[PDB]
Amino acid sequence: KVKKTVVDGIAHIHASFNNTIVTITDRQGNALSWATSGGSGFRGSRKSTPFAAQVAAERAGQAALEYGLKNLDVNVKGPGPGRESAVRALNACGYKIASITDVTPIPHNGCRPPKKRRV
Amino acid sequence: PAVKVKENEPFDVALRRFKRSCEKAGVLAEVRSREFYEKPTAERKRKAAAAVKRHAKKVQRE
Amino acid sequence: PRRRVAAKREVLADPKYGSQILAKFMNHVMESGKKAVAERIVYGALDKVKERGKADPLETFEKALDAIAPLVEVKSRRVGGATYQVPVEVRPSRRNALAMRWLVDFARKRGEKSMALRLAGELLDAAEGKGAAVKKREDVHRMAEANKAFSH
RNA sequence: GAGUACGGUAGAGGGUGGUGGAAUUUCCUGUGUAGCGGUGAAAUGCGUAGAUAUAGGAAGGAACACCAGUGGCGAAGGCGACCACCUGGACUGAUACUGACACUGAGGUGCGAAAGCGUGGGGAGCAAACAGGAUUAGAUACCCUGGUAGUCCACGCCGUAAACGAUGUCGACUAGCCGUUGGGAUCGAUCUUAGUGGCGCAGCUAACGCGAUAAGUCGACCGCCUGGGGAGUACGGCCGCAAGGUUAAAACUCAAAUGAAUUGACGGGGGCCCGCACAAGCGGUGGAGCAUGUGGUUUAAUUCGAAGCAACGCGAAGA
Numbered sequence A: 001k002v003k004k005t006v007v008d009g010i011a012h013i014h015a016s017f018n019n020t021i022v023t024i025t026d027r028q029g030n031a032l033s034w035a036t037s038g039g040s041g042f043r044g045s046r047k048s049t050p051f052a053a054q055v056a057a058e059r060a061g062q063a064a065l066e067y068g069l070k071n072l073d074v075n076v077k078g079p080g081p082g083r084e085s086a087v088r089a090l091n092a093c094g095y096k097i098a099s100i101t102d103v104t105p106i107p108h109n110g111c112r113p114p115k116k117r118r119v
Numbered sequence B: 001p002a003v004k005v006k007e008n009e010p011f012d013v014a015l016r017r018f019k020r021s022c023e024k025a026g027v028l029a030e031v032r033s034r035e036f037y038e039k040p041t042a043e044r045k046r047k048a049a050a051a052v053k054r055h056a057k058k059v060q061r062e
Numbered sequence C: 001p002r003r004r005v006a007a008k009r010e011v012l013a014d015p016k017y018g019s020q021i022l023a024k025f026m027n028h029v030m031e032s033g034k035k036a037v038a039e040r041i042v043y044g045a046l047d048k049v050k051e052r053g054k055a056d057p058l059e060t061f062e063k064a065l066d067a068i069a070p071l072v073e074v075k076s077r078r079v080g081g082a083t084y085q086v087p088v089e090v091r092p093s094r095r096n097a098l099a100m101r102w103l104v105d106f107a108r109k110r111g112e113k114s115m116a117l118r119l120a121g122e123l124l125d126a127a128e129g130k131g132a133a134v135k136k137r138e139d140v141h142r143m144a145e146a147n148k149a150f151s152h
Numbered sequence D: 001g002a003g004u005a006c007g008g009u010a011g012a013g014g015g016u017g018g019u020g021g022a023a024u025u026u027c028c029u030g031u032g033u034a035g036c037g038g039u040g041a042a043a044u045g046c047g048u049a050g051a052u053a054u055a056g057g058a059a060g061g062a063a064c065a066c067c068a069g070u071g072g073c074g075a076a077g078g079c080g081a082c083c084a085c086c087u088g089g090a091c092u093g094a095u096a097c098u099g100a101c102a103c104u105g106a107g108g109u110g111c112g113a114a115a116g117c118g119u120g121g122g123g124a125g126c127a128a129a130c131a132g133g134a135u136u137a138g139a140u141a142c143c144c145u146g147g148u149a150g151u152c153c154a155c156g157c158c159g160u161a162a163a164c165g166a167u168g169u170c171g172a173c174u175a176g177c178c179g180u181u182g183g184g185a186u187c188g189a190u191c192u193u194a195g196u197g198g199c200g201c202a203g204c205u206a207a208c209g210c211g212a213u214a215a216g217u218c219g220a221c222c223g224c225c226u227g228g229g230g231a232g233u234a235c236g237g238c239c240g241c242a243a244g245g246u247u248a249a250a251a252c253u254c255a256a257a258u259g260a261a262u263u264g265a266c267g268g269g270g271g272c273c274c275g276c277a278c279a280a281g282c283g284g285u286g287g288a289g290c291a292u293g294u295g296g297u298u299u300a301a302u303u304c305g306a307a308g309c310a311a312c313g314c315g316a317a318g319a
Ligand SMILES: [Mg+2]
Pocket: A117
């Protein structure tokens, strides 16, 4: 029942080798709409494709169109596929993109990663 | 790895410029480097092999 | 095959309608070298179509083919643990032959009296798009679109 | 030859304190809603008791992206965040000084990766043992989800590694070419010095290969070898808290074991190419009845022969 209005939001794309997660929020970091590849009906080896990321980005954008949101900045994070299909789907939704940034976290020395797989 | 869209250029120039900046920053290489633990023996072996190939290629140019 | 040496063979011998597609369909319905029997079957089916309704048989046949030729097809490729079924746009030459083959195949199992009448029924059904052949076509399309994540 | 005194350089050489930034994990809170995670595919597992995602705050531990390089330092093992303090060696230039003061080294003494052991702290990530899920004929494994000692620190022990350049230390001579590290000179160039790499003439080697950083030509001293197993094992001695370490045989058994290279064959190695080899199609066999050859069985005899592809409508184009 309750509604709200907001413009000039921020879209976070979280790519990985298995799944991608799209989340539109306002500038303060409060989520409005979100969509994934597993929630778009792929569920497996098809979940890890740029097509699934495109579908997820369009679905999330159509969900977030309720608030208005005529401006979006973009934050990409992850090595997986769909690192760019989501970004090209977001403008196809009808948005205007102020900028794009990459916020992938890189340790400087950090903790040690797991063992190497013997396949 | 951060670009801006300035003075109404199409959203194909901006995306390719973003890709070029990401490639220049070596993001994906850094992410692939730290996926698993590479024991120091393997790291030294990789460095030695890279040096051998580099020197051989540089010598072959003349 | 590897050589890519055999070009196509052209035969165009429609005896009484002057259509290439009719001759190709006569080739498809032929079995064991009975050219004339196939011509009689096709002509009987077209005459039944002409008699049933005011529609002329040639246009009905053509627009029945246009309502049955598929648009995309499924081709399988293995990756070492699973075989994915990628979609490919059927070539403009393959669609006609596939449509003809499907039409004659589902005509052969229609179940009514004679082959001429079976073809007649299949053409009437396909001109409106309600036979089993159109069910197969839409099944192929839905399978192909359900595997659109591969596409490339 | 070997050392001393005096300026100056380069350095992840060592030890004791302090401080940074990135990231992970846990905890608290706001937004928000149905998935997350994982895989060759899955499942175990995590979520509507509100997860994943996103934003703000806090705690704690460990490892120091880029620079980074066939780079540097160290007797070796080894040493990568920054700053201060204590400290060892090397390189470099001139003058002066001592006057063979040197090399090697059985015993002996000391340093010595990782794992491991004892006492006391610490606990993020990872991860032997362990548990569950898959795979499989089975799977005490590879793969997935978790996870304890350990990995970190102080003190003490252990004293072993493919601890390797598989090459003991010291000194003298022997064509050259191209890099690079720390310095000197002379006019970017030439010369020279101590390291670190790639080629290469002689010479050497069974060959591969080495070749001024020799495996070349010569000196000084030390260690070690004498066919493969049994065996670096048994017993004794000495070390250790324990794991164990070190010194170290015999009977018996075999006639070989081994190094380098050549030809072929092969590979769940690589690169090209072809063939009804796949892919796109048409018609069949396997089911029925009969014909015919074979196996087996039966018989007095069911006469011999052909046996994956390359035997079975085959010798037989006529019991
Ligand atoms: Mg894994």
